Write a protein that binds this ligand. Structure first.
Ligand code: SAH
Length: 261
């Protein structure tokens, strides 16, 4: 019954064309042309990002929504866009990335952007059953979209449930994907986590309109209900006023090489 659930219901009423127009209405995307060509050519020393994730984390990072410091852990790293971004930051001392990388799940990608050498990738790992490790910055970008709001809610509560075990070890910084912040139970878990660890949820402008995903971050504190609804209002507005107008932005190019001495 929340505004976001109404949004989800109306999203499912869109035919294929409607959905297509909607998905790219007033959105911002990075141009992946060059990165895709370089990766396809096997170039590992041009500093291109392995995925759209690098730009998403940079957005949070550059405006203080999440500080990237010391020991970084990246749950559900996939190709590794967040790991490579974090590894290139001077304040970061190490990066441990974990992901399934099996049964259709993408495996970490090997490139040599700055600090690749301080990253330890580990695949064939289900982070829901991985024993928490002490760290300073906790990152988690997991949440598989579903036509079912019930399912998005279940997957979202499971992620927050798992992440709470890691935050309970004591972490200074965090950035965690929240697939369905519009679901009632998720909203309440977020409110409880906020009273326990602080932070709030922020909508990344690089996220597509087809998902209501927002990120639980340590760099800001605000009323969760209000801001989740603001995003709901924006998404509903774009569905009612489709245009498919997209704004392209330069993708992230990181420096290259190992961090040594
Ligand atoms: N239970 C689990 N354990 C480990 N990894 C998981 C998982 N569930 C989902 N994942 C992985 O979480 C990843 C989310 S996509 C992450 C993109 C990454 N931030 C980047 O910048 O490239 C997917 O690769 C998915 O396979």
């Amino acid at each position: 019954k929340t505004l976001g659930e109404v949004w989800k219901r109306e999203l499912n009423l869109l035919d294929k064309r409607q959905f297509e127009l909607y998905k790219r209405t007033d959105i911002v995307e990075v141009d992946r042309d060059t990165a895709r060509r370089h990766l396809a050519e096997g170039k590992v020393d041009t500093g291109v990002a392995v995925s759209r994730g690098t730009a998403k984390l940079r957005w949070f990072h550059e405006r203080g929504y999440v500080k990237l410091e010391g020991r970084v852990i990246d749950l559900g790293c996939g190709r590794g866009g967040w790991c490579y971004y974090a590894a290139a930051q001077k304040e970061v001392s190490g990066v441990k990335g974990f992901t399934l990388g099996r049964d259709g799940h993408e495996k970490p990608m090997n490139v040599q952007s700055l600090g690749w050498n301080i990253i330890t990738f580990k695949d064939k790992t289900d982070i829901h059953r991985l024993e928490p490790v002490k760290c300073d910055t906790l990152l988690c970008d997991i949440g598989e979209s579903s036509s079912s709001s019930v399912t998005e809610g279940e997957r979202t509560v499971r992620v927050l449930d798992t992440v709470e075990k890691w935050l309970a070890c004591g972490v200074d910084n965090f950035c965690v994907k929240v697939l369905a912040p519009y679901m009632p139970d998720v909203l309440e878990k977020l409110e409880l986590l906020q009273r326990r660890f602080g932070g709030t949820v922020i909508r990344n402008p690089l996220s597509r309109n087809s998902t209501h995903e927002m990120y639980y971050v340590s760099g800001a504190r605000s009323n969760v209900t209000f801001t989740v609804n603001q995003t709901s209002r924006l998404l509903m507005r774009r569905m009612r006023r489709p245009t498919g107008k997209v704004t392209l932005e330069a993708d992230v190019i990181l420096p290259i090489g190992t961090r040594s001495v």
